[PDB]
Structure formats: structure tokens, C-alpha cells
Amino acid sequence: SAAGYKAGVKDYKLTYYTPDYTPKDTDLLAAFRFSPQPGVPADEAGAAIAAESSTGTWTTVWTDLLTDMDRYKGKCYHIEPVQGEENSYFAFIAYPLDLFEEGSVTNILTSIVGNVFGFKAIRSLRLEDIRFPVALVKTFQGPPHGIQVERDLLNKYGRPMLGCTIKPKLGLSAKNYGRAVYECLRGGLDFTKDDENINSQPFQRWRDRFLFVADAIHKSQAETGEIKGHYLNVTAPTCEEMMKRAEFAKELGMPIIMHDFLTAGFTANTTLAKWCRDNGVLLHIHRAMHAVIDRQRNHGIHFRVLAKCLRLSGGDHLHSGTVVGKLEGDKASTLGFVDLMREDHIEADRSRGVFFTQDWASMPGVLPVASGGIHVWHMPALVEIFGDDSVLQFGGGTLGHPWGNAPGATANRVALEACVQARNEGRDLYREGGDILREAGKWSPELAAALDLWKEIKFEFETMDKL
Amino acid sequence: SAAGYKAGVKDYKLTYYTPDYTPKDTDLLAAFRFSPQPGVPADEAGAAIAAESSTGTWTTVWTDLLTDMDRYKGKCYHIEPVQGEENSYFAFIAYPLDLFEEGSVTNILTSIVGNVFGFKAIRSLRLEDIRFPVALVKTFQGPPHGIQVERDLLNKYGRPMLGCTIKPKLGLSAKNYGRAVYECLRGGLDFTKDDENINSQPFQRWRDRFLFVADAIHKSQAETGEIKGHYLNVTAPTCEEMMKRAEFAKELGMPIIMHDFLTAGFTANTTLAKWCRDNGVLLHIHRAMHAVIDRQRNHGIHFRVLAKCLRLSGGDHLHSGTVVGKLEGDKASTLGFVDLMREDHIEADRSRGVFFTQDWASMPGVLPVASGGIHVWHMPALVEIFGDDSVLQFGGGTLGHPWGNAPGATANRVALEACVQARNEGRDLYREGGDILREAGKWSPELAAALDLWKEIKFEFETMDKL
Amino acid sequence: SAAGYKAGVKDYKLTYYTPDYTPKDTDLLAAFRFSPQPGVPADEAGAAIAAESSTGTWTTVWTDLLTDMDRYKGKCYHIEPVQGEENSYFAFIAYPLDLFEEGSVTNILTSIVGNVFGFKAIRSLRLEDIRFPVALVKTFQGPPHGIQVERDLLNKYGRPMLGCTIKPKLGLSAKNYGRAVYECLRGGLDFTKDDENINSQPFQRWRDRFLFVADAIHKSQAETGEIKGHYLNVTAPTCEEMMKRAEFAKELGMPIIMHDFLTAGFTANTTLAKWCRDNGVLLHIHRAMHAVIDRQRNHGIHFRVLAKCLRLSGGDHLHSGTVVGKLEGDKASTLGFVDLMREDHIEADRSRGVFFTQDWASMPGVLPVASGGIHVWHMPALVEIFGDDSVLQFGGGTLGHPWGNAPGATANRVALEACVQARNEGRDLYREGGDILREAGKWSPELAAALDLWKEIKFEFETMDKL
Amino acid sequence: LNKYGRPMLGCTIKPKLGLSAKNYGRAVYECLRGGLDFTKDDENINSQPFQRWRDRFLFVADAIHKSQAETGEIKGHYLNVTAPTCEEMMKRAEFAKELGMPIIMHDFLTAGFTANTTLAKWCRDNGVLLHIHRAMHAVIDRQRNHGIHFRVLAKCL
Amino acid sequence: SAAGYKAGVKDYKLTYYTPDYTPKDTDLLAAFRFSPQPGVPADEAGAAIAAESSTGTWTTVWTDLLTDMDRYKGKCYHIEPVQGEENSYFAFIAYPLDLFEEGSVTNILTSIVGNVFGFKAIRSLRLEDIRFPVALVKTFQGPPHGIQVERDL
Amino acid sequence: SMKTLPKERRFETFSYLPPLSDRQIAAQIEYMIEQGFHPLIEFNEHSNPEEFYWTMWKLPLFDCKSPQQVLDEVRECRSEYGDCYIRVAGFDNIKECQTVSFIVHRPGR
């Protein structure tokens, strides 16, 4: 029983550090990487994190004794120092299933990462991983459709899908936008897409874009004999305005729309993912602003947490990085969270950054989207890294082709299919990639022109987000 | 005119670095603190940021020439190295008014901070400030009510307002929750509040909390003769569920509700702020997860940007930190963004972290809320720092009083009024604060008991977020 | 992999009898009691049950090989013969979590008990228990409120609650109905109630009953100073008509309504339970028709399954039987399913009929309601069997009092409180019950008159539903 | 209104613009308690940075209740529901009804006859009295050589 | 600060004629062509227009002092006589951005042209032009489509 | 040694302090003058937290550089309305909010 109110400040480690705790299968587990302030012991730091992220505050309150605190409190049940890093530790914290609102990523984030990152007693803090228990995973809808259903809906099998972001990012009228869309799609790309900051602006209001883009899809589809799509961005100032936009996309019979889940938010995104499920529209998720949060390895939230949170909130695609392109992506941890966003069961593997074994209880996978600074020369690597179940996106790598969009699209589609055929035949994309590309360039002049153009372009910098 | 398509990669600094640019009054200005990768020049780094956050991609696209790129492109118009920091610079970038959807914080964030933070060519990046032009500020609703209207609605004048977060964070039933609320409010606090991770959970479903809390407000108000309120948390998994909760609060005649704007998102928050304006409910904004983003000074977004974004999206209160409490808050920059969230015109002042002069075109101010690890001994400092137009919140500093909630509330309310009287009389809260408190403790036994309890409790650590 | 289509009939035990299977924690487990037809082996009978209740039909179909049948098929993983019964067995069958629609009792029943009961090869079949895995339990809302929240809402603590069904079952006008309700409630009962077959009829249309009953509640509550309620029956021909009735109850501010979950159905009941949660109305569940299904121990479904299904679908009360009254209730198994409907964790215990350990993952309990042929002499036994967390209902035992309803209500309320006081003081209700009653009858003339009237009335027959 | 046997007396709150919602209601209470039947928004009080309309409606409603309880005579204040769009006009008219305000106000020429006719119908169905301001009329009706005489505009209204 | 209530009629030109005023970029500017009645001076006529179209009425009210009238009042900041027309002037008047409901042409018209055209002290008045500041222009939707989008459609 | 907190009606700012001496009242009025706020005396028969409006005593003291002038009006008001609550308020006309507010007189008994 709960006996005896004693007012005043105690140590957090008295209540919240529980190194004897063995997590239940219904517990939500979090792994934090932290550095304590000088003179703040690791275990008191871990317990402060567990306390302020569950049930505790800074002094003793009598109200604790009205309830059963043992069954509600977070339990920092393990601390280990980071190998080779001075004054850096992992704390592993268990949270009871009861602490969380069912089906709410918003609430899970508010608890785990709400306040503890700004603790004075803590120099830096980074959430590395969360083990979502199956009992909680089952309170979420997840992807509106997911990988299998999407491929069935679109009649797309046996290869990565190919997309293209229209450029310039901003500035084009609705008509020129659809023009660029038609030429890209007629050339052999499966998808085109709004850039993430195309919403509704003076130079191009959204309903106009939706209308002209719908026309470009019908034309290019009638010409090529393949299903075409364009991720129309419905990201908006308010829920109402977001729904309005999503609704007109449905009205036009558009198979796929687009949402920025971090800048719009998880509450709006979860609304949209539900809508999409009920209305049979596919949901491409852009990850804008993620690097504000996930880049540096000392402070923030690793993307693989954000990726798990989105699989729960709901999306059919999610940008996963390129590894080889203009934006940062560590190959080891990228293979880690691609597995986390695709598979049903992922064993813990610290070499991939996977701290906890994750089960998804048959919740559909999310197609990874490689986008950003990639071109034809990257194609064998992209196929080897991501495999068939991916979307590879070439913005500048299509619209920056010497002959324009349709030749640009053919170059990429030929480069892709060549790599897939070579792979299926048993060629090593790693060793023979450039040769497979040069061979294909022998009979594809538009591919040859692209290979010529981008031969020298590599992105090779030191990755900040080291495991 | 636009003449001549030349395919291939150029330098960003060729198009996007414009050191001769003088920003128009309608430009949105951003200040970034960045470190380039070795061998990436500062000006090319600044131009890469301006490019990928406005109109540009990684190769040349012909579609540029369909539009007028000079009038749409971001312009890195100034770079200066950080004084004393090696390989650290400020880039100042101007963005045309045309790039942004009217009244959308979601879209502004997606553009400015969407992708540029993960650029391989960039080691670290942090957004310090944004100058929102008046023409854009006027497309937003802003606070549903704001400081003046709120004080008029509540009949609260001449002092800081006093609140209290109910503890434990999680675990209490709806009835015990309202019990703790009644005892706090009857003791002299203006507000109580849900903790940020109280949403709807197995141990306490939201409608039950709203119902029992409404009863506690009526009782404590009838007893004391002062308007009472409780920030009911309507933060939810989906927009629909958020509106539902907000709606029942209105039904009960609750004067104030609560929202986590970052974990729920700006799209949901903007929906809620509009609703609140139309339904005359006050909106307390919790800032959960902000420190994941704003703590470290090398990478992320400074809180003063998030605070400006929220004043635009809409909230009547916003947690501003304590400076002196358990969570980090730098005094200089805190005074900076408190001015930014309160005043109509704030001159640029780099000693306060204010990079740009900001005008608000008569958009209402947001009450700053000091909350986290504070108690009676902090009262003179809190009053001196924040002044009258603030809400001071004591969670553990009320419920951890030796005699319970109502004595705990009286202790704080007496401590507050004593400090305000002393201030008005011309006493120096800095010099004479403890004396003003000891004097008041002579005639207030419950204040004396609190002074006794928390005499030794200070939070004094090195602040990571140095200017 | 799935290899080789061979058309034709095989034995079920070839695919579906898997005695080496160890159930996963996410499996739904069922215990069946069956007798095979002569010449049908037990294991083939068990496998036929597992087959036709999961994935299988009577011949081999090629379509099996399009999917992964090992991961979907039901697995009769254990068979044991019933001790002492000839040709009677228990089959224990595991069903994958994937087989069931989330939050649907309708679907669970359709699978487990849809067709297998009419198998020619099976003489008799009875479902004894189902282990609902926690992952599935969490997809249900459960009780709108449950025991704790209900007691808090009504200010009812420290004793069983007391109700009364108005008689005659049918025939009274709306005005005489409310008359009988006022006299019962003013006498000291907490609740009155519609009989289960009072819906809307020529002699009394429902809106008239709701209106006159609301008046009787206000009057009797104003007189006694205790919260009063009347379970208004909203059971109806259609969903629409059910909602309409529930809606007018809310309009009148009625705290509690009533539903027949079996004769109306689980789909309508689940609709109503959701509504009730959103509208703060308590839900009394009547169990009419249950004995058509659960009486005989050789064929049907044991009530403890129906009780678990209702806790999932949603109800705040459920009729549980009396044991001692006019309708059948075996004491051992009644204590079993009362635990199942009340507690969070119930260990397997075959002496109580509990075949599987059941966890409820903090889903609220359901108040058991003892109703049917009970009177004051039964009071010590009812209190001993059910304890405080119960509702004891006296229809004829109130309205059949010599002096009428209000004296009848006082007799029961005095009898109850006497028993509760005696119990709290340490008296044995078993040994001293009649003495506690005779003592109380010394100072309560209306209690004395009831004791006199019903001294000789016992219900003592052989129970068909033997464990 | 129980008003017989005399002209009714009103008062437009001044300054035209600049007062907060609370000071607006303050001026309204003091006017009404003194013996005037009505107070009123100036015609260019709609919803502005210094005073948003819902705030004015709320504080004015309080001033009406207080001054009416004090004097024992029915009081009213013409709340201006003139708005940028029909939707916004209806919204404002609706909150006036919600507060039990007996009378609202509309600028029929600057808002227009299509919006005004909408509002007049609404008012009939919702039992709210409609005070019509004639702003801009003199742009049209002043000079005797060109324009429309007010007596036409009055018949049209 | 606002100090001292003095009841009674003053000249409009005392508060509202401000020939030293330089319009802010957020000001709404109006150009009026007017003829004053005989014995009504041009500057008092211009100030009467600025007064009755912004914040002022015909006597002094104490309620002015509850607010900051300098920041709300219209400012007749310039008057010029019409070249060659006898007793005809242009008044140029600045109005603070705060005076107007966002996105409402109805409200802008009600303020600028609501009453001032029927002033007894004024023989004739004509609004020639209004400078809509960009901050206000941005609160309006404008053409549903406009020229370019229409031709494309 | 905990006391149960007494139930006692309060009146917003300063009402948890021991009642203001006339010197303490004047110190608060001095603060107003210095801050540039305009004093206003209001009275009401009741102190209901819900009501927005009390009744104005005369007009706000706009031209006031003298605490005693305010104190004289309070004395005069208390003479005419000793049956009422009387409250001194300061008004900031720049921010247009009431900045100060405290009861200077509760009704007789």
C-alpha cells in the first residue's frame, strides 16, 4: 500500500532507477543517448529522464499516494556507457502500456520527448529507438494501403518505381507545371510530384495545379499504356483546408496525394491517413524538417524513430534518403530503418542502429523513397541497396536532361530496367553497374546523353550521423 | 528574358549567392548558423541553402526558363563568420513574399527548414531567426484573444496569473484529478492544468476528466469569489478527436483549453486556434518536444522562431521557460523571445538573440508561462523577469506542500502578491526578495512551511544554448 | 513454399490437428466440449472444428497455395477426454490474431461458432471458454464507464447497489409506470428498471415512459437526497430507432439506459456502447435469451464466454444470475465469470470453469447484477457471494411487499445495510444472516413484514449446467 | 420593446474607432443606465485589430443586462453585423441571436442589397430587429443634377 | 498620455488636419475633390472629412482618452487647390491600417465614403483614388482566376 | 502541524495580503501616477467574479498628479456608497488595459 507523505525533494534514482526491472512484452521501451552535466551521476540522470517522461516531478507530492505509482512510473532499468565516448551513456527506459492514448503518435511523443531534452542537469540527449509493443501497434491503422496493396492497385510489379519532382521548386504556373508533368510521364516515369513547398501560392493556386496535372496524367497514360500518377501536395494551413484539397484530388480520380507529416504534424497526418484508407487514395509522405531533428548524433531523435512513428500514423510512401545523393544518409542505419518500415519482424542489431526487436503484427509496410541529388550513374547502387520495393526519384536527374523531360524519363527508365534485368540474370550491380549502363547506352541515345552529362557528379562528405 | 538552356551541374553561388541584394520590406528573412564540410566554401554553402529552400535543385533544368527565376529565387545576400567560432557562419537569406501560402506556418517551415538541414555538404545548421514581413503577418489570425482580451475576460489585473500542474503526471482517476483541482483552486491559484501527456488513457478517459474538473471549478469559484480555470488538454490522435474534445469543453462552459502544438502539429493547432476564436475559448499552448529541436546551438531551430510561428498559428498562452527552474532557459535570449511574443515592435538586438526587427501589425501578444521546477523562493525573480503579463506555474511547488494543495496554493498566492506590492512600492525584488518573503511568512504559516521546505533547492547548470 | 495441387478430399487431421503446437500470446484460444458421431475419431473431429472455423473446407482447393496456410489455419493443438463422461472430449484450438476484425465481437463469434456446431460428424458441441489475447482486447472500447467510474458518477460507495424491476412486465400505462417508479425510489432503492420486454407497445409508447419516469426520478431524488436512476430500455427494431430512444434519454438527463444485447445483437450493442461513452450515459445490459444458448452443458455456449464478449462489446452492468433465485445459476462457475467480468487478471481454474488465464489490459470491469426471484431472506447470501461491487435487484421482492413499493424498498435497503454493517464488523453472513435480519426487523416494521411474507420461499432444483 | 408614447433615444459610441471591447461596453453601460433606450456601433465598427467583433458582442451583452436590471426598462444595442461576405455576416448575426440581443445593425449600401435582403429574411425568422445605417448614400443622393434621390433608396430599403 | 477632458465643440482642424504627416506604407490613402461651403475654410473642410471618416464626431467626448487617438485618427496631411477651378481642392487623407476589417471592401467603403459626402459644410465631394496598402491587399482573395489562368483554362 | 485552509471569499489582487493601510493604498496610487496610469474609482453592490462591469464613480481621473486627489474621491465615494464595494483601478490607454485593481472598501458588515 501507499503509506506516508513526506514533503520535499528526493533523488529521482530513489524511485525511478530500477536496474532489476525486466520489461514486460506490453512495455514501451526507449533508448536514450545522453551526457550528464558535471557532477550529475549517470543513474540519477537516467532516472530524471524516466521520471519527467512518465509520472514524476521535482518534489514529493502527496497525490502520488492516491494512486499506485509502481504500476505507472517509467523505469530506467538499464544504463551502459557509450564505447569510446567520454561521459556518454545509453539509458533504457520501460513505460507501461497504460501511459499512452490508443492510436496516438502525438501522445507517445509528448510523453517520451516532451520535456526531458531541456533538463538543465543534462547536456545533450538523443532518442535512438522505441520498441512499440504489439498491443499498442494494434491500436493504430498504419499505412492506408502499404506495399502489396499499392502494387496491386497500380499494376506495378517486378521493379522499383520511378518518380520525378518538378522543378523549379517554386515559380511555375499551373499550366507549365502540368506541361512538365506530361512530358516526364510520357517518357516512362511512373510518378511525378509536387515539391514539398508547393502548396498554394500567388503564382500557382492549388486547385489550378490539381486540374492541369489531372489532364497531364490522363494524356500520358493514354499514350504509354501504363498507370501514371502524380503526388498532389495537400499539405495545408489547417485541417479543413487539407481535407478540402484531398477531396478534390479524389474528385478528379487522382490515385495518390502527398503530405509533409512533420511540418503539418502527426495529428493532421493521422486524420489524412484515415481519410485515405476510407477513400482509396495512396499517401506519399514527405519528411521535410526531419534533419532539424535527426542529423546530429548527440542531440535529437534518430530518423528510425520518426519512420516507425509514421508507419503507425499512416503513410504508403516515406522518403528514406539516398545514401549516395546530395543529402546525408548513413548506409548501415538506412538499411536498418528501411527494414523497420518494410518488414513485419526486425531483430535487434546494433550494427544497423536497431536497438530493439520490433514486431508489426501484420501492419503493412511503407515503400521507401530515395530522392535527392541522384542520377543514372547511381542506378545500380540504388537498386542494390533498396531492391524492388522502393521508389527512386529523379528531379534534376530528369528535368536537367539535355533533351528535356521525356528523354530524361526514358534515360532513367531504361537505366532502371537494364539494372533489374542484369540483377535477375545474376550480374553484380556493384562490380558491373557502369558496364550494364554503358551497354544500355549503346542502344539508348537519351540514356547515353545522361551518362555523358552526369559522369563527374558525386556527393562524398563526412557523415555527421555516425552510429 | 530567359535565354539558353545549358544542361548540367553549376555552382549554387552562381545563381543564389547575391551579396548585392537589399531585402524588400515584403521579403521573409532567415538567419542561419552553419558549418560547411571541409572544402565547401561558405558562400557556396549559403547559396546551397538559399537554393534548395526556394527554387533550385542540383542540376540545371530547362523549366526554369519558362518562368522568371530572378523574382522567385532565395537570395543569400549576406554571410558573416561567427566571432570566435572556427568554421561557423551566419547566412542571411531573403525569400520573396510569393513563395509562401497565406496563413500557413506549415508551408513556411516546409520551405525554410524542409531539406537544407540534411545537406551532405553541410556539417551542422541552425535557424536562429525569421523576419516575418508585415504583409505576411496579416494573413494569419494569430492568438484567438491575446493578453488584453484575456485579462478582460477573466477579470484578472495587476499581477501575474498563477497556475498549477496536477501530479502525478499520469495515474490518477478522473475523480481524484478533480479533487486535486478543487483543493488547488480553492487555495488561491487562478488556474490548474492537465499535464501535457494527459490525453485519454485507460486509467482516466478524457470526458470523465472534463466532467469532474468542471465541477471542481464551479465549487472553488463559488467559494473564493474569483474566476477560476483549468487548461483541459484536447491534444488528440486526429483532428476529429481534437475537435470533439474542444467541443465538450465549450459545452461545459470551460474558459480555457490546452494544446501541444509541436507533437500534434501546426496544421491541427491552426485549426484549433481558429475554432477557439469563433467559440471564445482561451488557448493555452504547451511546447512539448521543443528541446529536441531547440537546445543545442549548433544544430536545430532556436525557440524564438518556434515562438513567432506559434504567435502566428495561434495561442493565448505559451510556455516560455523559467530561466531559474529545472529546465534550461538562457535569461538574455528568454527576454528576447518574450518581447517577440508580447510586443508589437521589437528592434533587432543581437545581445538578446534578436537578429531582425519584427513588427506584428497589431497582432495580439501571447502570455508567457513560466513552468517547471519553480517554488516560492523563485517568486521575486519570476516577477522581476516576466512582469505582470505572465502566468507562473507551480506543479510540485503546490502539490508538494507539507499541508497539501490548498495551503500550497495560498503560499504561492501570498508570495506573489507580497512581491507585487513590494515592487509597486519601489522595493528591489532582486535585493530584497528573500526579505519580502520572510516578512510575508511572518503572517502566513502556509507560506512559512513552503519557504522552510524548499530553502535549499536550486537548479544551476551550464546552459548548452549559449548565444 | 506451397507446392503441388492435389484435388480431392483429405482428412482434416492431416492439416488441422497439430498436437505439437504451442500457442503464441497473440493467439485466440477456444475450448470446446464435443461428442463425435460413432466412427468419427476424436482428433479428426477436433481438426474438423479447427478447419471449418478458420480456413478450411471439405475438399482440397488450389487457392490455398496462393497463400501461406500454415500462418492462417486454426490448430487443434490439444484434445483430452472428459473425466467420467463417455465419448466426450475437450478440444483446445488456437486461432491466429490475423483471422479477426479488430474490435468486432460479431466477427469473432461468426468464426468460432459460425458453422461447426451443425457438423453432421458431430453429435453435440459446446464452447466453454475463449482466451482473448491482450493484443485483441486492446482493439475494443469495452465498458463505457465500468465499476470505478460509475460509483464516482453516482456517489455510491461502500455497498451493493439496489434496484427493482417494475411489474407487471407489461400492461401498465406510462403514468402508472412512473408512479410505481417514484414509490420504489423514494423508499430507498438506487435504481428502478424497465422489464426487458418493455420497449414500445400499444399500452405504453416509449417516449411517454421516458417522460413520466424522468419526473419520478427528480421527485424521489429531491426527497431522499440520494442520486436515483432508472434503466430506460432503448432496445429497438432498428439501429436508428435505438439511437433515437438513447438520444431522448440523454436529452432528459437520464444517467442510465438499458439494452438487450443478445436479442438486439452485438452490432447494435457495440454501436450503443460507443454512443454511451461519448455521451456519458451508463449502460445496463440485460441478457435475455442467454439460456436458449447457455443452459445445457452438452451443447451451446457457456455464459462466461457471452460475459467476456459483452465486456468487450461494452456494458456497465450485466445480469449475472442470483444462484439462489428463481433462475439457474451454478455457484462455482458464477464466481468464475463474475471474476472474469470484474477483474483485470483471472488465473485459469477449472473448478470455477475458467479454462484459460484471462488478461484485460486495464479494460474496466462490469458490475454484476443479481436479479430474479430474490427477496430479503436472500440478502446475506447475495452480499457474501457478490460483495460490494454488484447490483442486487428485487422486482417482486419490492412491489409484492404487503404495504406497497416504498415500504418494500425500505425493507430491502435496511436488510442490505444491516448485512453490510454486520459484515464490516466481522459477523458471518452465512451463519448469522437470519439473525442479522431478525435483529433489523426488530426496529424496521416494513422489513419485518417482508421477512414474514417470504419466510417459506426457496428455489432449490437440480442444476442442468453442471461443470 | 414595451416602448410607447415617445420617440426612442439612442447613442453612437465614440470615438468611431480605437476603443477595446471592454471600454466599448463600459461606455455602453454608462449610456444605457442614464436613460437612453439604445446604444450603437458606429457604422465602420465591424471587426478590427483593436476590437474583434465577438469580443464586442460579448461585453456589450453584459452592459445591456446590467443597465436593464438597474433601470427597469428594456435596453438594446445595435450590434453591427456588416461583414466582408454573406457567411461572415450570418455568423455575426447568429451570435447576436445566441446572446439574446434584440437588435442588430447593417450598412445596406456598402454591403449591398443582396446581402441586406438575406439579412432581413433571417431577422424575420429569428425575431431580431434590424437597424439600417445608410453609409455612402450621399455619394449618390446629394447633388440634384445627377444621382438618385434618397427617397428612392428609402423605398428600396 | 491622454490628459484632460474638456467638453464642447472644437475645430476639426485642431485634431485632424496634420500637414506635417508623412504616410506610412501601411496607411490607406484617399484623394478627395471637394468644394467647401462659403465661409468654411479648406483645411477645416479637409479635417472634417478625415474626422467623420475615421474616429471623430461633432463635439468632444471623454471616451477618446480611454484610447490612443493619435494612432487611430485619419490625417488630412495635404490640401491643394484644383488648378483653374474656383473653390475646388484635393484633400489627401491617410488612414491607419488598423481601421479596416481584413478582406472587407464593404467596411473600407463604409468608412471612407459612409457619411462625409452629406456634410452640410461641404457643397460637393468626390473620391478620386485610394492607395490600398500591400498589407491590406494581401487580406483579400482577389480574382477567382485572373487573366493568365483564364486564358489557360 | 497542518491546518485545514479556511473558506474565505477573496477579491482578486492584494486580497490575500493583510488589509492595506491608507499609507499602503497611497503607495499603490503613487505607483499608478508614476507609471502614467489613469485612476478610476468603481463601486458595486456585489462582488461577482462573472460580471464585467462595476459602476463608474464620476469619470476617470485623467489629469491627476496627486495621490490625495484619488484618495479624496474614494472618501467621497465611500460616503455616498458605503453599502458597496469600492475599487481603485489604473488604466493604461496605450495598451488599453486595466493595469491595477484592488478593493479599497468592502460594504458595511
Ligand SMILES: O=C(COP(=O)(O)O)[C@@H](O)[C@H](O)COP(=O)(O)O
Ligand atoms: O528537392 C528534393 C529532391 O530534388 P531533386 O530530385 O532535384 O534532388 C527533396 O524532395 C529531397 O528529395 C528531400 O529529402 P529527403 O528525400 O532526403 O527527405
Ligand SMILES: O=C(COP(=O)(O)O)[C@@H](O)[C@H](O)COP(=O)(O)O
Ligand atoms: O512537468 C512540467 C512542470 O511541472 P512542475 O510544475 O511539477 O515542475 C512541464 O509542464 C514543464 O513545465 C514543461 O516545460 P517548459 O514549461 O520548459 O516547456
Ligand SMILES: O=C(COP(=O)(O)O)[C@@H](O)[C@H](O)COP(=O)(O)O
Ligand atoms: O423478470 C425478471 C426479474 O424479476 P423479479 O425481480 O420480479 O424476479 C428478469 O429481469 C430476470 O432477472 C432475468 O434473468 P437473469 O437476471 O437471470 O438474466
